Swiss-Prot record:
Post-translational modification (record): The C-terminal inhibitory domain is phosphorylated. Phosphorylation relieves autoinhibition of the kinetochore motor.
Organism name: Homo sapiens (Human)
Quaternary structure (record): Monomer. Interacts with CENPF. Interacts with BUB1B. Interacts with SEPT7. Interacts with KIF18A. Interacts with PRC1. Interacts with NUF2; this interaction determines kinetochore localization. Interacts with SKAP; this interaction greatly favors SKAP binding to microtubules. Interacts with TRAPPC12. Interacts with CTCF.
Domain of life: Eukaryota
Residues of the full protein shown: 4 to 339 of 2701
Name by which UniProt lists this protein: Centromere-associated protein E
Amino acid sequence: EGAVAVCVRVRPLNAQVYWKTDNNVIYQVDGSKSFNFDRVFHGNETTKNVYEEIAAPIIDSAIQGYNGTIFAYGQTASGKTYTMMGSEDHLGVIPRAIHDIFQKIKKFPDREFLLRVSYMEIYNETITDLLCGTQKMKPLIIREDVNNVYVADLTEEVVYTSEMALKWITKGEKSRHYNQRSSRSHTIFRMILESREKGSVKVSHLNLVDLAGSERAALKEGCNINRSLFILGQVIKKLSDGQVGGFINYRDSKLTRILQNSLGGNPKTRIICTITPVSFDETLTALQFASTAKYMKNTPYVNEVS
Ligand SMILES: Nc1ncnc2c1ncn2[C@@H]1O[C@H](COP(=O)(O)OP(=O)(O)O)[C@@H](O)[C@H]1O
Ligand SMILES: [Mg+2]
């Protein structure tokens, strides 16, 4: 199978170091806690390495008509945005995916490709489109179609070049820029890839998700709670325990309902758990989440339509 995979990414130091990594084990220093993952990336490993090992195979699967979802999960300042968006000197998984897709579809001259992108924010259970004007930004509504959840009136932009796809991301990014909001917000970058022979059509949704900071993941109000992250935890816990169907409260948050198909459903899902080794409690919560997520079972197939 290998439909679900989890890795951890330790950020380098910018205070006791509470965590160290020995191969693919993250262990508490002079402590009892340890967690095995399929891959742990150390402070000196690059977003290029993370992209190539974790994301590249999902981009390959997307071009073959599999749904694919990549999440960055972890504490504020742990590396989520560094990993998923990055900068000119060190591109994130999202810009790398876009370059990668446009370079890789050229290896299929037998096939016609149509690509379009959407970019949305979820903040305090409100969905906003990041690609329309600031004027046109309003709370959007999750609806179902003839079969599948969608975000009603979410801009979809056709893109023929990486340059135009990256111009849409830049636009959305200055709109995300528009107090401590981006650390409490989820962002979903989506590419819908359609292809056919140059005639059934392969349709895949590639979702690349930068989550709200897990400090607010999790029974009183000593401090703050993000509903989407709490429900994400709950949904993944229920799936990993072997439950299915109406037991699974996808509808309790915008995030879990939008990405319901990424959590036990039709796609290939990867979680990149980002951690700062100078954090104890927030790192521990993130590694428990990540560890639970390893045992989530997805059933992905090629999406070919009439
Ligand atoms: N792997 C890394 N290597 C170098 N700098 C990093 C790395 N991960 C994070 N940083 C830096 O640490 C800071 C916090 O990272 P950021 O991705 O903004 O965190 P988050 O989005 O999870 O809140 C930023 O200045 C970022 O560039
Ligand atoms: Mg961030």
